[PDB]
Design a protein around this nucleic acid. Structure first.
Ligand SMILES: Nc1ncnc2c1ncn2[C@H]1C[C@H](O)[C@@H](COP(=O)(O)NP(=O)(O)OP(=O)(O)O)O1
Ligand SMILES: [Mg+2]
Ligand SMILES: [Mg+2]
Length: 430
DNA sequence: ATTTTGACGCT
């Protein structure tokens, strides 16, 4: 009752760019705009692997991971943009730079946590309070929320058969219900949050050309879930009160961190399917099956409560370069391994030097990882060494030194290598 | 022959 926390202390948003790499390429090449389009890496093997897909192309069934030749079978007029290739490998520089454009705009509004190349969490609690002070008891107009969905609404009793009609009906129900004169109301706080996110999304689109979606809720997991509910080019507010119905038919795997083995174990061990069913277990029961930390997290999360903070971190903490060498292309000679380590080290040097100039920091550890043919794990082996100079020849030599004894017998390398990976870590200020 | 990443947990 009066002491049961409800996880309504924060306003958190998650902003995720729509078909991000595709929009970067469509901005660059107007011929690709408003077309079924995908971004592909490499080309020789089955036309290249698709890594991003426009919504027009998704309507034909094109998905990430599809070979371009196969996507063309579903969508004969599919247009393609290729990732830059440098030193024999895919180069993602253009997308990292476009990401910085977006993150720098978002950081004008609030502290952000860069969660991936095209998404960031925003802690809006302070900004909402300031905005509530600015507009004392002044009602919030639907005009301030032109792209917002209120999850769960409309409810109860032709304008109801088009999606914009439904969107506005739900928004009207929500705003009609609001208590505008209490500045401590969580639902009001979320609504002001959504007004700010509309402003943020408009700024991103104005200043970059890129569209995005967003979720606004009281924590990162609900914000992330909300964001996906009405992609693309829309934002969704998930209130605390919307959680029971939302979670009552929500597959466990849809919640952040439960899409893999742990989520599968929750389903198998407890014999449930939906996130809401978790409420019927005690905290101790969940801790007994999934550990103290996971158990406590699940117990709170199924009630819509999560405390993971929006970390103040706009820049990646590691800078890595990797290449797979699948099937017959697996690396089988010492010279091959050394040449590709050099290629990777040269890209890494270029990125590290730019990073040192832009961000006043230096990496101090080099992690070298390899995969051997047959091992299904991403990494078969990981070894580190000191990273003392931004020099590609030195980094490649040091990586070879730290992995060379993985070679059962050689001039020859065995078993063949299916992946090389260099990652610069442990940054210190410079 | 899905590729190239990046954050974080466990021991
Ligand atoms: N498995 C993968 N391998 C490589 N790159 C990938 C990837 N998954 C995504 N990317 C790259 C390419 C993606 O453009 C970018 C962002 O990933 P999303 O936010 O998950 N997907 P997007 O923004 O395209 O569409 P949506 O509107 O549904 O958000 O990261
Ligand atoms: Mg995206
Ligand atoms: Mg994303």
């Amino acid at each position: 009752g009066p002491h049961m926390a409800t996880g309504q202390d924060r306003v958190v948003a998650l902003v995720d760019m729509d078909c991000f790499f595709v929009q970067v390429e469509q901005r660059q090449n107007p011929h690709l705009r408003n077309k079924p389009c995908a971004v592909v890496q490499y080309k020789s093997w089955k036309g290249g692997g698709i890594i991003a897909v426009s919504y027009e192309a998704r309507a034909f069934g094109v998905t990430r991971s599809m070979w371009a030749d196969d996507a063309k079978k579903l969508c004969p007029d599919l247009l393609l943009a290729q990732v830059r290739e440098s030193r024999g490998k895919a180069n993602l520089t253009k997308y990292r730079e476009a990401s910085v454009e977006v993150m720098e705009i978002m950081s004008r509004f609030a502290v952000i946590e860069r969660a991936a190349i095209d998404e960031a969490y925003v802690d809006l609690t302070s900004a909402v309070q300031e905005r509530l002070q600015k507009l004392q008891g002044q009602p919030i107009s639907a005009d301030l929320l032109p792209s917002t969905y209120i999850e769960g609404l409309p409810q109860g009793p032709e304008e109801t058969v088009q999606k914009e009609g439904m969107r506005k009906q739900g928004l009207f129900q929500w705003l009609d219900s609001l208590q505008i004169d209490n500045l401590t109301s969580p639902d009001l706080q979320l609504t002001v949050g959504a007004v700010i996110v509309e402003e943020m999304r408009a700024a991103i689109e104005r200043e970059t050309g890129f569209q995005c979606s967003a979720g606004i809720s009281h924590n990162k997991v609900l914000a992330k879930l909300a964001c996906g509910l009405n992609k693309p080019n829309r934002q969704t507010l998930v209130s605390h009160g919307s959680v029971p119905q939302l979670f009552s038919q929500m597959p466990i795997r849809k919640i952040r961190s439960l899409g893999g083995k742990l989520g599968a174990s929750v389903i198998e061990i407890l014999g449930i399917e939906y996130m809401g069913e978790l409420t019927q277990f005690t905290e101790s029961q969940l801790q007994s099956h999934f550990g103290e930390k996971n158990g406590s997290w699940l117990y709170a999360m199924c009630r819509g409560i999560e405390h993971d903070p929006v970390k103040p971190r706009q820049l990646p903490k590691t800078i890595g370069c990797s290449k797979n060498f699948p099937g017959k292309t697996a690396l089988a000679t010492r010279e091959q391994v050394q040449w590709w380590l050099l290629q990777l080290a040269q890209e890494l040097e270029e990125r590290l030097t730019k990073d040192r100039n832009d961000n006043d920091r230096v990496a101090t550890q080099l992690v070298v990882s390899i995969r051997v043919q047959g091992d299904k794990r991403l990494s078969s082996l990981r070894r580190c060494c000191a990273l003392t100079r931004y020099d590609a020849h030195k980094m490649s030599h040091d990586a070879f030194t730290v992995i060379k004894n993985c070679n059962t017998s050689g001039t020859e390398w065995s078993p063949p290598l299916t992946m090389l990976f260099l990652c610069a870590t442990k940054f210190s200020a410079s």
